[PDB]
């Protein structure tokens with residue numbers, strides 16, 4: 001008997017889904033995938049449930065102020081989102097002390113502006129918790145109630161839990177290769193060289209995006225082989241690949257991203273007004289996604305701002321990872337013109353077809369420049385031959401206005417002519433994640 005309790009409200013969408021009042025209790029039967037088979041004790045109706053809507057009855061996951069499965073950086077982004085107030089907080093699993101916890105608190109001061117401060121919650125050997133030795137607690141709930149009453153050494157008195165929203169429904173069971181009839185294409189979002197993108201509805205209940213590839217552009221078997229790898233590249237900063245239609249014209253079904261391409265967003269009324277530290281955060285998010293791709297020994301091949309998508313909450317997600325590999329070169333695709341962009345591509349990829357994670361690093365440097373110029377064409381005033389010849393002679397784009405020198409230094413590292421001399425995305429991710437807090441302590445040393 002493994003027992004869980006519902007967190008959010010969820011109703012039937014598929015064959016056998018159940019009732020989810022905000023506080024119903026159930027027993028887990030099976031645990032394969034993100035959909036769990038389970039039986040309820042309330043009115044005892046049965047079927048399948050979304051695992052991310054439930055939580056173990058004795059676990060901290062039931063608490064409003066506990067955020068399971070997020071990082072320190074995630075925590076900071078979430079707390080700094082609009083709608084949160086001074087003293088907004090969360091408790092999360094510690095990233096640097098396994099089994100222990102961390103408290104993250106939204107702070108403000110006129111010098112540093114909006115920040116998030118982090119505290120180590122230590123566990124007592126015989127039970128309980130403390131941040132400072134003079135104030136111990138039997139439960140994390142007692143700790144929270146204590147610091148809601150007064151700061152007692154913290155940067156702020158705790159106010160309310162970090163705002164959150166009901167998570168995405170997990171994708172339907174075993175609906176990887178889906179029938180084309182399951183999709184109603186509702187709005188064409190754009191047309192490109194080798195296909196179109198539509199907003200669509202999947203089986204009357206789920207909003208998705210559908211990339212519709214032109215006949216002649218891809219092979220079903222080649223595409224599917226690659227797509228079966230793509231779908232496993234699951235990370236908060238990569239766009240989620242839900243499903244495919246494995247018949248020409250091949251369809252690629254992904255999560256819908258409300259603010260479209262980062263390139264378009266940077267050139268929009270709203271995006272053109274993002275302050276520099278937000279631009280840096282965008283850059284960090286993309287680098288986190290690319291560090292994942294690097295860790296997974298994968299290659300993007302066409303990294304640039306056009307292929308970054310932006311969510312309604314301004315989360316950046318990498319799209320089209322690996323796709324260029326399975327776009328075919330034939331009479332059909334040739335009729336369009338110009339497969340990959342010279343100004344974004346590493347010289348060894350151009351010259352020899354050597355695409356690697358290091359040519360992606362080169363491209364990332366170009367993307368950084370796209371970001372800090374709000375979407376300007378790379379190498380303004382230069383033709384493609386001019387770019388290639390200048391690069392060969394050690395020319396690189398100069399630092400533009402409103403670009404921190406350290407950011408430009410990262411670009412210059414990305415643009416080493418020898419690929420082995422370019423940094424790892426693991427390195428880039430670390431320097432961008434800590435861009436403004438490099439000389440600052442990890443956690444607050446509270447007395």
Ligand SMILES: CNC(=O)[C@H](CC(C)C)N[C@H]1CC[C@H](n2cc(-c3ccc(Oc4ccccc4)cc3)c3c(N)ncnc32)CC1
Nearest residue numbers: 189190197209211254255256257260261263306319320321
């Ligand atoms: C004037 N501006 C325009 O015309 C610009 C295009 C320019 C920025 C170049 N117009 C474009 C701007 C991006 C728009 N777009 C593309 C995708 C997408 C991307 C990749 C997908 O497939 C994948 C394949 C492999 C791995 C991951 C995903 C699926 C959907 C997408 C989405 N999921 N949600 C929302 N908008 C999306 C479409 C119209």
